XYZ file of C-alpha atoms in Angstrom:
251
model
C 14.827 -20.617 -10.301
C 11.817 -21.625 -7.931
C 8.238 -22.898 -8.547
C 6.917 -21.675 -5.213
C 4.425 -19.167 -6.668
C 1.976 -22.117 -7.201
C 1.816 -22.588 -3.447
C 1.427 -18.794 -2.956
C -1.306 -18.409 -5.732
C -3.302 -21.066 -3.894
C -2.915 -19.499 -0.507
C -4.132 -16.114 -1.736
C -7.583 -17.585 -2.510
C -8.200 -17.775 1.315
C -7.096 -14.172 2.091
C -10.794 -13.118 2.561
C -11.033 -15.336 5.615
C -8.537 -13.058 7.393
C -11.076 -10.289 7.377
C -13.000 -12.076 10.220
C -10.338 -10.710 12.601
C -9.629 -6.919 11.957
C -7.503 -5.197 14.487
C -7.025 -1.358 14.521
C -4.529 0.030 16.915
C -6.304 3.025 18.814
C -4.386 4.603 21.575
C -5.423 7.817 23.470
C -7.963 9.849 21.332
C -6.923 13.422 20.483
C -9.272 16.159 19.187
C -6.377 18.403 18.097
C -5.135 15.759 15.489
C -6.508 14.587 12.128
C -8.403 11.367 11.946
C -8.183 8.968 8.918
C -11.379 7.012 7.939
C -10.645 3.978 5.739
C -13.795 2.321 4.166
C -14.117 -1.242 5.113
C -14.931 -2.442 1.522
C -11.582 -0.894 0.424
C -9.779 -2.974 3.057
C -11.602 -6.070 2.145
C -10.881 -5.516 -1.468
C -7.367 -4.500 -1.119
C -6.570 -7.719 1.100
C -8.287 -9.893 -1.507
C -5.894 -8.589 -4.197
C -2.834 -8.742 -1.958
C -0.440 -11.561 -1.565
C 0.178 -14.070 1.290
C 4.202 -13.347 1.291
C 4.952 -10.448 -1.149
C 4.376 -6.885 0.102
C 1.713 -4.864 -1.816
C 1.043 -1.223 -1.800
C -1.150 1.759 -3.070
C -1.590 5.419 -2.622
C -4.549 6.747 -0.862
C -6.558 9.806 -1.746
C -9.494 11.334 0.266
C -10.817 14.635 1.595
C -11.953 16.397 4.849
C -15.511 15.951 5.702
C -17.910 18.782 5.287
C -18.474 19.114 8.953
C -14.865 18.547 10.496
C -11.816 19.742 8.658
C -9.771 17.341 10.734
C -11.842 14.129 9.675
C -9.967 13.004 6.572
C -12.367 10.507 4.802
C -10.456 8.224 2.359
C -12.383 8.033 -1.023
C -10.003 6.091 -3.366
C -7.169 3.721 -3.363
C -4.806 3.992 -6.286
C -2.874 0.847 -7.402
C 0.186 1.960 -9.381
C 2.696 -0.105 -11.097
C 5.001 -1.638 -8.341
C 7.444 -4.460 -7.765
C 6.751 -6.228 -4.586
C 9.377 -8.006 -2.332
C 9.340 -9.773 1.022
C 9.383 -6.968 3.667
C 9.703 -4.130 0.950
C 8.154 -2.823 -2.165
C 9.464 -0.528 -5.106
C 6.512 1.874 -5.863
C 6.281 3.984 -9.010
C 5.744 7.823 -8.659
C 2.697 9.575 -7.245
C 0.330 9.211 -10.075
C -1.198 11.969 -12.018
C -4.966 11.466 -11.887
C -6.233 15.012 -12.612
C -7.851 14.249 -15.793
C -10.193 11.748 -14.147
C -13.820 12.431 -13.086
C -14.798 13.051 -9.483
C -11.228 14.228 -8.648
C -12.255 17.673 -7.806
C -10.575 18.640 -4.614
C -8.957 15.227 -3.926
C -6.080 15.221 -1.340
C -3.191 13.041 -1.401
C -3.290 11.542 2.087
C -0.534 9.015 1.824
C -0.256 5.252 1.197
C -1.302 1.686 2.300
C 0.506 -1.673 2.191
C 0.700 -5.179 3.510
C 3.260 -6.485 5.824
C 4.159 -9.997 7.084
C 5.551 -8.510 10.493
C 3.701 -6.913 13.374
C 5.311 -3.745 14.713
C 4.615 -0.561 16.772
C 6.489 1.665 14.308
C 7.534 2.136 10.710
C 10.191 -0.486 9.600
C 13.316 0.652 7.864
C 12.066 -0.142 4.329
C 8.915 1.670 5.169
C 10.848 4.896 6.069
C 13.138 4.309 2.964
C 10.287 4.291 0.465
C 7.963 6.679 2.300
C 10.800 9.282 2.110
C 11.430 8.507 -1.407
C 7.778 9.129 -2.374
C 6.704 11.988 -0.173
C 9.912 13.714 0.975
C 10.054 16.325 -1.730
C 6.332 16.243 -2.424
C 4.166 16.102 0.861
C 5.521 15.649 4.410
C 2.131 15.041 6.197
C 1.382 11.904 4.041
C 0.625 8.999 6.552
C 1.556 5.329 6.206
C -1.154 2.850 6.777
C 0.590 -0.430 7.456
C -1.438 -3.561 7.291
C -0.075 -6.634 8.917
C -1.654 -9.738 7.498
C -0.889 -13.075 8.750
C -2.770 -16.478 8.607
C -5.756 -15.622 10.790
C -6.159 -11.889 10.827
C -5.193 -8.466 9.651
C -3.982 -5.641 11.881
C -3.928 -1.995 10.768
C -1.555 0.745 12.110
C -1.170 4.257 10.819
C 1.978 6.306 11.179
C 3.199 9.858 10.485
C 6.953 10.401 9.686
C 9.273 12.887 11.443
C 11.590 15.193 9.500
C 14.415 13.177 10.871
C 12.881 9.970 9.353
C 12.663 11.830 5.937
C 16.392 12.675 6.103
C 17.279 9.211 7.236
C 15.337 7.804 4.171
C 16.966 10.291 1.786
C 20.435 8.963 2.970
C 19.433 5.258 2.821
C 18.040 5.497 -0.750
C 18.455 1.801 -1.720
C 16.453 -1.101 -0.282
C 19.295 -3.411 0.710
C 20.050 -1.504 3.983
C 23.356 -3.308 5.112
C 24.156 -0.234 7.239
C 20.752 -0.024 9.042
C 22.775 2.893 10.637
C 20.983 4.705 13.460
C 17.537 3.526 12.583
C 14.844 4.840 15.209
C 11.369 3.675 16.114
C 10.998 7.324 17.139
C 10.958 8.379 13.571
C 7.313 7.239 13.169
C 4.301 8.461 15.212
C 0.931 6.985 15.917
C -1.675 8.446 13.679
C -5.502 8.190 14.379
C -6.885 5.615 12.001
C -10.529 4.831 12.151
C -12.321 2.089 10.087
C -15.849 2.630 8.815
C -18.541 0.662 6.900
C -21.011 3.401 6.541
C -18.858 4.985 3.696
C -17.784 3.228 0.350
C -14.784 3.656 -1.639
C -13.257 2.790 -4.943
C -10.088 1.986 -6.921
C -8.190 3.739 -9.635
C -5.820 1.528 -11.615
C -3.202 1.621 -14.341
C -4.863 1.964 -17.880
C -3.321 -1.316 -19.059
C -4.719 -2.938 -15.844
C -1.352 -4.598 -14.793
C -0.136 -3.159 -11.528
C 2.115 -6.207 -10.298
C 5.382 -6.376 -12.100
C 7.326 -9.281 -10.330
C 6.894 -11.639 -13.434
C 6.828 -8.609 -15.793
C 10.455 -8.160 -14.612
C 12.367 -5.291 -16.303
C 9.178 -3.760 -17.778
C 8.750 -1.952 -14.424
C 9.947 1.708 -14.858
C 9.839 3.508 -11.430
C 10.039 6.890 -13.174
C 7.200 6.123 -15.640
C 4.383 8.449 -16.405
C 1.532 5.980 -16.092
C -2.187 6.525 -17.133
C -5.035 5.669 -14.884
C -8.755 5.078 -14.574
C -11.403 3.864 -12.185
C -11.774 0.099 -12.398
C -11.652 -3.309 -10.597
C -8.114 -4.077 -9.571
C -6.697 -7.512 -10.658
C -5.560 -9.791 -7.861
C -1.805 -10.508 -7.465
C -1.628 -13.686 -9.356
C -4.016 -12.703 -12.207
C -3.507 -14.034 -15.748
C -2.415 -10.755 -17.162
C 0.348 -10.459 -14.225
C 2.071 -13.833 -15.865
C 2.343 -14.293 -19.676
C 5.675 -16.040 -18.873
C 4.012 -18.955 -16.952
C 1.671 -19.486 -19.872
C 4.508 -19.218 -22.293
C 6.665 -21.523 -20.477
C 3.874 -24.088 -20.379
C 2.680 -23.193 -24.105
C 5.958 -24.441 -25.407
C 6.910 -28.066 -24.913
């Protein structure tokens, strides 16, 4: 029963300023492993549409460069219907985008999301949803976790061990009261490189709306959504809150 979105919508305005400070965790370089290249424009645009407190997520699709099979260039970010929360997010199914142009040979590389908490590993909720999404579908999908906090954004990319996938399957819900035998060893540093010499684009639900906090029960996690290329709306866009306009419209 709170009116605190006001404060939050105003805050999101300034999110672009955080892009002055972009940190990417790079440990020891390895030539035997895959490296993931995220276009800087996609980071920029993805932050700008994000929220200051609520978590926001998207799938990432790309393909191996012509030269190196182990260099996975990210080509597209796919915003799907989701329901954001603090420190967690309910994400709808891996989208069907086969009918779309320029998707010839696209590989599902994993997902990307914001976070209000800096870490060296995948949190519980990260493992919970990561498993739910990719457990039965694709195990090598990575998790690009973006920690955005007043002043900067910090990017870390993780793989998930089969143990992690088991744990996530067991802990299916998001209210993890058990938190039983969680392990920072589930996740694993993944090489994430940021590049501004390659440009990427978004794919979005046909009805535009991807954020369903105010849409409420209209969010169906098992929904078959249709998609298209397009410019994603920001978190507190007009179409994301007919309620606020209705509440005002009357009386």
